[PDB]
Amino acid sequence: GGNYNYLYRLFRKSNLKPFERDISTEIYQAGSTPCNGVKGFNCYFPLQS
Amino acid sequence: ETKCTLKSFTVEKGIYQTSNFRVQPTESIVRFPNITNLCPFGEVFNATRFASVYAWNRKRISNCVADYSVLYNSASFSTFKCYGVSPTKLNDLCFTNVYADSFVIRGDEVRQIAPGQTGTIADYNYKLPDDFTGCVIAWNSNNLDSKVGGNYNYLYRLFRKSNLKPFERDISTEIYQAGSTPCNGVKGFNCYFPLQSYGFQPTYGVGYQPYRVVVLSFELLHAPATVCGPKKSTNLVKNKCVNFNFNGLTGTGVLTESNKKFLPFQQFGRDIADTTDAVRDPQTLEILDITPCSFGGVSVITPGTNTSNQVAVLYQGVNCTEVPVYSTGSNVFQTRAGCLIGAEYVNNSYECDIPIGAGICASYQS
Amino acid sequence: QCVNFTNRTQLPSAYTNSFTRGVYYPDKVFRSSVLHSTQDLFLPFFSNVTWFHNPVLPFNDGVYFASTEKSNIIRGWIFGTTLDSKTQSLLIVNNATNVVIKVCEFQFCNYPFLGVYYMESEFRVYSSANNCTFEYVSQPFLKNLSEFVFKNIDGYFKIYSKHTPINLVRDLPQGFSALEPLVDLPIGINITRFQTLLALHRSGWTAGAAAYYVGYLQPRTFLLKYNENGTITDAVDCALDPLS
Ligand SMILES: *[C@@H]1O[C@H](CO)[C@@H](O[C@@H]2O[C@H](CO)[C@@H](O)[C@H](O)[C@H]2NC(C)=O)[C@H](O)[C@H]1NC(C)=O
Ligand SMILES: *[C@@H]1O[C@H](CO)[C@@H](O[C@@H]2O[C@H](CO)[C@@H](O)[C@H](O)[C@H]2NC(C)=O)[C@H](O)[C@H]1NC(C)=O
Ligand SMILES: *[C@@H]1O[C@H](CO)[C@@H](O[C@@H]2O[C@H](CO)[C@@H](O)[C@H](O)[C@H]2NC(C)=O)[C@H](O)[C@H]1NC(C)=O
Ligand SMILES: *[C@@H]1O[C@H](CO)[C@@H](O[C@@H]2O[C@H](CO)[C@@H](O)[C@H](O)[C@H]2NC(C)=O)[C@H](O)[C@H]1NC(C)=O
Ligand SMILES: *[C@@H]1O[C@H](CO)[C@@H](O[C@@H]2O[C@H](CO)[C@@H](O)[C@H](O)[C@H]2NC(C)=O)[C@H](O)[C@H]1NC(C)=O
Ligand SMILES: *[C@@H]1O[C@H](CO)[C@@H](O)[C@H](O)[C@H]1NC(C)=O
Ligand SMILES: *[C@@H]1O[C@H](CO)[C@@H](O)[C@H](O)[C@H]1NC(C)=O
Numbered sequence: 032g033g034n035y036n037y038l039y040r041l042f043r044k045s046n047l048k049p050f051e052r053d054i055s056t057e058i059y060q061a062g063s064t065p066c067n068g069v070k071g072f073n074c075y076f077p078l079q080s
Numbered sequence: 081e082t083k084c085t086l087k088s089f090t091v092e093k094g095i096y097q098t099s100n101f102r103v104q105p106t107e108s109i110v111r112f113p114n115i116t117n118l119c120p121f122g123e124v125f126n127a128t129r130f131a132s133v134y135a136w137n138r139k140r141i142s143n144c145v146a147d148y149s150v151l152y153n154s155a156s157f158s159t160f161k162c163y164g165v166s167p168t169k170l171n172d173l174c175f176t177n178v179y180a181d182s183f184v185i186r187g188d189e190v191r192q193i194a195p196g197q198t199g200t201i202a203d204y205n206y207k208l209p210d211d212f213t214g215c216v217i218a219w220n221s222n223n224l225d226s227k228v229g230g231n232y233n234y235l236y237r238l239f240r241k242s243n244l245k246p247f248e249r250d251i252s253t254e255i256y257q258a259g260s261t262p263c264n265g266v267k268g269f270n271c272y273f274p275l276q277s278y279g280f281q282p283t284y285g286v287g288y289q290p291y292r293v294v295v296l297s298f299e300l301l302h303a304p305a306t307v308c309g310p311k312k313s314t315n316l317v318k319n320k321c322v323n324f325n326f327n328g329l330t331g332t333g334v335l336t337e338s339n340k341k342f343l344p345f346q347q348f349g350r351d352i353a354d355t356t357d358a359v360r361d362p363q364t365l366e367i368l369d370i371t372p373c374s375f376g377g378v379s380v381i382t383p384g385t386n387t388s389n390q391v392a393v394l395y396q397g398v399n400c401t402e403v404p405v406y407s408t409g410s411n412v413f414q415t416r417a418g419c420l421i422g423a424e425y426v427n428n429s430y431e432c433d434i435p436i437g438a439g440i441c442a443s444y445q446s
Numbered sequence: 447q448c449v450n451f452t453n454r455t456q457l458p459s460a461y462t463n464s465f466t467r468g469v470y471y472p473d474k475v476f477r478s479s480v481l482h483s484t485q486d487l488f489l490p491f492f493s494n495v496t497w498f499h500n501p502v503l504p505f506n507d508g509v510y511f512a513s514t515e516k517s518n519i520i521r522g523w524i525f526g527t528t529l530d531s532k533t534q535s536l537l538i539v540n541n542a543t544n545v546v547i548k549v550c551e552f553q554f555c556n557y558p559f560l561g562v563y564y565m566e567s568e569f570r571v572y573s574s575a576n577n578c579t580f581e582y583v584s585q586p587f588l589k590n591l592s593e594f595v596f597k598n599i600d601g602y603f604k605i606y607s608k609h610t611p612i613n614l615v616r617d618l619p620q621g622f623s624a625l626e627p628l629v630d631l632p633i634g635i636n637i638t639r640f641q642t643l644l645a646l647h648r649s650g651w652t653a654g655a656a657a658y659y660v661g662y663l664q665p666r667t668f669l670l671k672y673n674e675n676g677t678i679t680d681a682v683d684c685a686l687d688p689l690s
């Protein structure tokens with residue numbers, strides 16, 4: 032049925048420093064219009080299974 | 081600092097050199113050509129009418145500036161999918177030429193327009209390579225293309241013996257022969273017209289309404305690239321050591337007015353040893369002058385640790401205008417060797433103890 | 447509109463001295479009262495230049511084209527490899543209003559020409575053209591001496607030009623005059639041969655006094671002198687003789 036327990040980040044504001052850990056599950060503003068914490072156009076969940 | 085550099089806890093009378101300094105840049109400025117010759121996107125995305133899917137309209141774009149920011153930021157586009165490159169970075173990287181394929185399809189046929197897709201349109205009307213690079217934009221056109229009586233002006237192919245190669249258009253109206261009975265150009269038991277006309281109507285629901293689709297492809301021929309986004313520019317400043325990027329020529333210095341006379345085809349001059357000396361601003365066409373902002377070493381004059389603990393500081397060959405706790409100190413003095421602080425100048429004349437330069441030197445009395 | 451002729455246009459292609467002509471600004475920089483040594487493609491000093499009183503001529507690396515022009519008879523230029531629709535071709539025309547540059551696949555005639563009607567309107571240089579790629583329109587180029595230098599480097603076509611008032615009768619004058627850049631084109635063609643377009647009076651054709659000079663370029667090192675205003679005033683060919 033598929034293992035959906037393993038998820039990876041795809042969207043971020045910048046790169047990661049060496050041995051850096053980031054866990055915040057915040058929505059990403061992919062466009063000029065802010066999302067204001069609401070999923071929508073130019074707004075994607077950064078975690079993908 | 082003298083103790084640290086000399087690696088001792090005691091210092092004898094004399095003058096020593098500790099470190100150096102330079103004036104730091106303040107801000108950055110970029111100047112680019114005046115920006116014009118925009119690519120004609122208005123005639124394609126706002127055309128009076130669109131061609132059929134099996135006869136998709138192909139347009140060539142070359143030798144112009146293309147602003148993808150307005151297209152990406154427009155909210156009138158239902159679908160905006162870029163596969164080869166990210167839509168954000170379109171204005172950065174660019175190629176030699178662009179192909180625009182424009183047509184009208186159904187709402188449910190939208191996702192057929194993608195690499196590795198199958199369907200009637202995806203096989204007999206428009207084929208895309210798996211390694212396709214570019215973007216696809218789709219938007220509603222129900223208010224215009226759809227007709228209350230049925231808009232039959234749009235047709236599409238369904239019957240063909242073989243599939244289509246990528247970026248291939250077939251407009252032949254040969255009667256398809258599904259069965260083994262040959263037809264002399266007439267339909268019948270097993271012969272059918274490959275083209276069928278759409279029945280778009282305003283009363284049709286979502287997924288049946290007309291959809292205007294434009295696909296942009298960027299090709300990578302060995303010819304030099306000419307088509308991409310405008311280069312951001314900014315106003316200039318003068319008499320301040322800053323870093324500049326004049327038309328791709330980068331350098332750090334202070335910019336002043338110059339009276340040199342160029343010829344109408346140069347862009348930037350130089351003097352000797354490949355050192356740039358004057359530039360021409362593309363937006364204004366004015367000759368400027370570049371001077372490296374000041375720098376120099378520093379030195380300390382001390383009468384010996386065993387005598388006292390007060391020292392004088394000399395900045396070598398620096399005009400006493402931009403010195404910066406020793407920003408004021410004592411009466412600041414200006415010498416042909418630089419600027420000297422912490423010591424007082426007198427009108428007497430003694431022997432020389434700690435040579436300084438330009439014919440003057442200091443001693444301990446303060 | 448494509449007809450041949452009977453009078454085989456043959457001209458006494460003589461030889462003459464290149465003297466010290468054909469020096470152009472190589473870069474867009476400014477230098478004041480300096481001596482700069484540069485290695486590039488030039489016309490060697492005291493070379494042998496061909497004088498023509500419209501044969502096919504190889505392009506090689508570059509071409510120097512000079513004309514003691516009177517009444518601006520010379521009109522256009524044709525560049526390419528196969529000179530037909532099989533390969534990309536370049537075409538240049540200069541009428542009384544604009545210079546027109548086309549990068550396309552034409553079907554040239556055996557004797558292409560402009561032609562004038564005796565209010566001038568005649569164009570029968572080629573027959574068919576399609577897949578036309580690059581287009582350009584600009585200001586017209588033209589008792590004077592017109593010098594042009596054509597180069598093709600790194601998919602870039604460079605054209606340099608200069609005009610000089612002259613009064614000498616026959617041969618190239620003994621003097622110096624730098625050539626300023628005129629136009630650059632970011633186009634890719636494998637140009638190897640080139641032609642010349644003549645303006646005959648179509649009213650029978652009468653155009654015979656079309657005398658010009660053609661020379662070829664080679665890579666070498668020159669020494670250039672820049673005066674206080676940044677204008678080249680003198681040049682020295684390094685690989686000519688021990689003094690140089
Ligand atoms: C197609 O036409 C529409 C309608 O005018 C354009 O949308 C307007 O674009 C201008 C840009 O100057 C904006 O100021 C308006 O706010 C836009 N209005 C709407 C309703 O979108 C659109 O830009 C045109 N597209 C092209 C490619 O020319
Ligand atoms: C560059 O574009 C700008 C945009 O207007 C112009 O530069 C100045 O424009 C104002 C008003 O149009 C004029 O009063 C100035 O004289 C212009 N400056 C110069 C140096 O011409 C102008 O259209 C363009 N200028 C250049 C040099 O390309
Ligand atoms: C240090 O810089 C100042 C200004 O940056 C110099 O003062 C200028 O001097 C010139 C010639 O002496 C005058 O023409 C200017 O009017 C002066 N400007 C100002 C604002 O004073 C000063 O001369 C420099 N120091 C030295 C030693 O030359
Ligand atoms: C102009 O370009 C088109 C497109 O490349 C050429 O059409 C091709 O012609 C050759 C002729 O041998 C055919 O084999 C190809 O199948 C054609 N391709 C397409 C997409 O039509 C056309 O030949 C070119 N014009 C000229 C004069 O060569
Ligand atoms: C270099 O540029 C200078 C600056 O314009 C030229 O000097 C002027 O030349 C004109 C033309 O004869 C005279 O009318 C002016 O009186 C000159 N002014 C000055 C201050 O000299 C000069 O001719 C140019 N060429 C050379 C070789 O110096
Ligand atoms: C410093 O001077 C004092 C007296 O002037 C003397 O006793 C002492 O030895 C001196 N220091 C050194 C390191 O010689
Ligand atoms: C030295 O003398 C000159 C001239 O008399 C005067 O201007 C200057 O102030 C004097 N310097 C000091 C430190 O008194």
Ligand SMILES: *[C@@H]1O[C@H](CO)[C@@H](O)[C@H](O)[C@H]1NC(C)=O
Pocket residue numbers: 461462463464493494495
């Ligand atoms: C060019 O060469 C020919 C023979 O090759 C010679 O007769 C002629 O004088 C030369 N032209 C010059 C040296 O200007």
Ligand SMILES: *[C@@H]1O[C@H](CO)[C@@H](O)[C@H](O)[C@H]1NC(C)=O
Pocket residue numbers: 541542543544546566
């Ligand atoms: C010169 O050629 C251009 C383009 O070929 C044309 O627009 C213009 O009218 C021509 N001028 C004359 C005087 O024929």
Ligand SMILES: *[C@@H]1O[C@H](CO)[C@@H](O)[C@H](O)[C@H]1NC(C)=O
Pocket residue numbers: 589590609610611
């Ligand atoms: C010759 O060139 C000069 C310099 O541009 C120009 O003023 C003159 O009109 C030209 N004469 C002819 C006949 O082309």
Ligand SMILES: *[C@@H]1O[C@H](CO)[C@@H](O)[C@H](O)[C@H]1NC(C)=O
Pocket residue numbers: 634635636
């Ligand atoms: C020129 O010819 C070379 C080899 O013959 C080829 O690789 C190149 O693509 C050609 N370019 C043009 C512009 O014809």
